[PDB]
């Protein structure tokens, strides 16, 4: 049984995460930031987690505090659900083509936080993905992955090999992180 | 049962493909272009497909029309054999060292055609691999992969990380595409 | 049963290797070069081999002859334990993040020796990792992998994508080679 | 008596080599690739070997598999004929001018395979030498020398100092390798 | 009879050399610097000298004084054993491949000291080869060859054509100097 | 018996050459150009030829016509003395250190004239070596070697690897050509 429920309340946001590592992709995400909900839904589904996230935060300022606090809490939930990590594969990686984009992630569930994020085109440091609700600044992608690795206490390396569309580039990275985790958390039949 | 038989007749060529995704490498290829037969035999075997290809075409002009038409028909056969794609891994990738060459392919069985082919040394845009029969112009490698992805309706990304011999460089790419497909078409035990 | 015992005596060193490909990481290494013992222990464990190495050699000169002779003998033991290679996956690869470092290895158990080692920062050609016993010159990493591939008769491609600490850079490569071998030697359920 | 007979049958080719190191240049070569026959005849004659090679292979694809398999088998025959290498010169080198070309080879019969091939003009990576039979792609020169060194288990270093004509450049290298071997295999009157 | 015994005592070191040019490789070297003993043992053996060297010196400072004084004394012993040089080949050269390294030396026994040492990679000016005893700084290679040429009163040209491992690069040069001397000191059957 | 006597009379010069390939260095040269006499005396001695050259020519103009005509006649004498070339080594090369200079020559007694002369420092295209008699312009070195190769009908490749003094640079090349010829003309005990 590899489950964790994390509640995180700050002046800026209120988060509840329920996570099961051995899920089948039963995912419900609601953070008030719909493009981030979309990315975390991709992450939960492609990782084959069961995952509920409910977050409310100060989106009148912008999405950053809610996005970061949610990734902190999700990271904590992952590190708590992994427990002593006995018997698992520990290493995982995945390539994700998404039309013109190719992204990759590799993970070591080592207990030492580390994140290296490389290759994202420079226009992503000032791109906004905007719809009819609160927008998502793609500069935050790096912060999401760093907050995840820091609080799960894992090494997470995320690379964009190439790509052009900012939604494809973002979504392929969240998917790659998701499939890398899925491989690394699985029981290893030889250990 | 994941099988397709495709017949494609044009003014330029006559093709029959019989494909089974759940094969054991039972492969017979005859296109009149023996180096291409060799590459498609590698592709069928390393993908663990059962695959028969019989093609006749206008090789007095050169191999291009037969090669492209065969890849179009093979692509169509793959997309037809995959059917609704329920329950499969969907993503697959593979590295293939071949002496000095290292190639890689990643696939997303997404239903949207896309191909990105990168890294092949520039001398491959005018190299000929010639024996005692119809020769094979390595410039056509890109067209084969694009025609495969376009007609199977999948994302296919093929990279040459490095290499020198044009037969190794070509053959390592066909093998990589083959092993990437093999992983992506397999049933996924968690979906 | 995929086991080999190799004894190799030269003027410079005396080596005994006992290797089992189908092990569970039962590893004991003693070469007189403690950082190399550490790397070969990583290699045996991450490959899920059972592996005993006992080497004594001319470390008053420096570690090179003992290190190389041991890798030659270990390579021979691998190629002997693999036997006719019937029914195995044959290809294997692995990414290994280790804090700031990311390394990768890909293997083809082809029967033709080949090694390509790329990306290691230039300071590793004159770095020493020194403790209270015989030191380890990281310039030797390349020679270890080449001697392994040459005597097992396999293609081994080892890459450092990036990194800074010489112990992380070294150890991530030995781990990557180890996990790539583990994948490639495994029985392939479809062949 | 320093003789070896090697038979090598693969799906791609059937090879028989009979080699005598202490010959007088009695050489008969028939591989189905007449420019390669010419180069191996040069090699056998300039090395003062007696050498018979008979190879048949899949030249409808192109010459590569027959060429490589023959060099593998010839390498094995050399390493077998050298036996324990007692009493020989061990090191050998030779310069070969051939009109505008100057090539060189150096050998160490060390028991550790190694090949370094440098200086060949870049146009040789896509040059074809074509007559009325199966052609020879000069990109294969490097692969021939590497396969020879790998299977004889010797260090072979081949350099083109300069040159322009691809037949002179190729033939001067095979001659240089041949004369370097001839010197290195000879009995050394002081050991 | 071409023999010399040289004793050289300084405040820093005490050296005894016994040299025979017409030897069979009977070599015993003990200087307190085991990697240097290894190189001088290579030099004596590959030159087909009989050579005893016994040196003790101030290795608490470092190896330099013992290494240089020994090469001075060995040079003097060579120049004394050559005597009037009547009837010898006088010129000698040798290429030495050592895995990835290729080194070369040429000699003229002219009676005028000269040394030109070129091609050694720049990292060798600050590389240490260290084991469990006194280490060897590869910056000293040049000084060894210069001291040898200066005291034997010969022209000695040592080149590294290419290479990477500092032990291979060093050892291939000492071997090349050794085989070049062996050729040059031999009786010339036509003079 | 490998001897030739050549007389060559032109409006510009009168030459007599007597050459024996199987000599012991009995050399007498008198051309009216004393530095050229010195170089041809080096050439005859280091080649172990017996060689008499007596030339008189229009040195009031400068040395060029006498120097070139003598090299033409000497070349003709070499090609005539070699006869059918049966049973000889055919290939020869030699390195010649001369203080700071290192030169090299390689020869193929092929019956096709060819000369490639490379590496000589650019100041040699306008250097004069002057004493109390007729001077020698070092620009002529290339013409001497080309005239030798053209009239003996051999491939001659002469290289200066490095050097500074024009007399050392010149003399080391003539010596290298001489020792390369000496090796190439010798009977080959295996053919
Ligand atoms: N919410 C955290 C971190 C943060 N605040 N603004 C942007 N990032 C804090 O208040 O320090
Ligand atoms: N066969 C197709 C595509 C094609 N024709 N020549 C090269 N490529 C056509 O006729 O358009
Ligand atoms: N031990 C082997 C290889 C080697 N020696 N020094 C460094 N590498 C030999 O003696 O040739
Ligand atoms: N014949 C060998 C090597 C090779 N195949 N194509 C080019 N080189 C094999 O099948 O792996
Ligand atoms: N031993 C000699 C030369 C030397 N001293 N330190 C480094 N080299 C001397 O005392 O001058
Ligand atoms: N002596 C020959 C060649 C020559 N003349 N001046 C420089 N070189 C002739 O008259 O052509
Ligand atoms: Cl990659
Ligand atoms: Cl050279
Ligand atoms: Mn923040
Ligand atoms: Mn989307
Ligand atoms: Mn087309
Ligand atoms: Mn092939
Ligand atoms: Mn070594
Ligand atoms: Mn460690
Ligand atoms: Mn090949
Ligand atoms: Mn020819
Ligand atoms: Mn000093
Ligand atoms: Mn050594
Ligand atoms: Mn002229
Ligand atoms: Mn002089």
């Amino acid at each position: 049984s590899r489950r964790a429920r994390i509640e995180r309340r700050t002046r800026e946001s209120d988060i509840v995460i329920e996570l099961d590592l051995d899920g089948t992709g039963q995912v419900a995400v609601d953070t008030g930031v719909p493009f981030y909900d979309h990315m975390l839904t991709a992450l939960g589904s492609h990782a084959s987690f069961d995952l509920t996230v409910r977050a409310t935060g100060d989106v009148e300022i912008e999405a950053h505090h809610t996005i970061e606090d949610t990734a902190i809490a999700l990271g904590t939930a992952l590190g708590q659900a992994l427990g002593d990590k006995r018997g698992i594969r520990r290493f995982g990686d995945a390539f994700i083509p998404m039309d013109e984009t190719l992204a990759h992630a590799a993970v070591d569930l080592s207990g030492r936080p580390y994140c290296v994020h490389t290759g994202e085109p420079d226009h992503l440091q000032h791109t906004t993905i905007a719809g009819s609700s609160v927008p998502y600044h793609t500069v935050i992608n790096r912060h999401v992955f760093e907050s995840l690795a820091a609080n799960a206490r894992i090494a997470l390396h995320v690379r964009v090999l190439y790509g052009r569309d900012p939604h494809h580039i973002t979504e392929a990275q969240y998917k790659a992180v998701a499939r890398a985790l899925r491989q690394a958390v699985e029981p290893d039949p030889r250990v």
Side-chain angles (χ1 to χ4, degrees), chain A residues 1-10 12-85 87-152 154-191:
Chain A
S1 197
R2 296 194 295 170
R3 284 181 185 148
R5 181 194 162 90
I6 291 304
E7 299 187 19
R8 170 201 183 50
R9 328 185 81 97
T10 61
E12 292 78 28
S13 62
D14 182 28
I15 320 292
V16 185
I17 311 276
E18 302 173 291
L19 170 64
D20 189 339
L21 307 177
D22 303 298
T24 53
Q26 305 316 118
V27 177
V29 175
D30 179 4
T31 67
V33 187
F35 183 83
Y36 186 51
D37 294 340
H38 179 45
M39 293 300 103
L40 295 182
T41 295
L43 190 153
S45 313
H46 285 269
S48 185
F49 292 166
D50 297 339
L51 173 65
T52 306
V53 173
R54 164 189 200 201
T56 51
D58 56 4
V59 292
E60 64 282 7
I61 291 175
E62 55 134 320
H64 183 121
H65 298 155
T66 296
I67 285 174
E68 175 179 356
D69 293 3
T70 296
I72 292 172
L74 175 56
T76 303
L78 179 56
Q80 186 178 304
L82 281 169
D84 62 15
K85 293 179 266 171
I88 65 175
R89 170 67 68 160
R90 184 189 159 193
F91 295 92
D93 86 281
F95 278 94
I96 299 293
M98 187 166 186
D99 291 4
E100 83 308 333
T101 288
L102 185 65
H104 183 249
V107 69
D108 176 9
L109 311 173
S110 74
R112 285 183 322 270
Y114 219 89
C115 182
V116 181
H117 178 228
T118 51
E120 210 180 53
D122 288 340
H123 59 281
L124 264 78
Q125 289 181 28
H126 57 83
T127 285
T128 297
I129 289 179
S132 56
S133 177
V134 170
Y136 179 94
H137 301 118
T138 51
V139 70
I140 209 67
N141 302 162
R142 187 164 294 185
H143 200 21
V144 175
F145 307 148
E146 287 174 347
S147 300
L148 214 184
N151 295 280
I154 67 172
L156 175 55
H157 281 53
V158 181
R159 298 186 289 145
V160 169
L161 286 87
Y162 45 76
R164 181 179 181 270
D165 183 277
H167 184 145
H168 297 166
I169 284 156
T170 303
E171 185 167 341
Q173 288 175 275
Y174 275 87
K175 287 177 181 174
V177 166
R179 295 195 164 249
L181 293 172
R182 173 173 162 184
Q183 183 168 64
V185 305
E186 281 164 350
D188 180 337
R190 294 187 62 197
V191 13

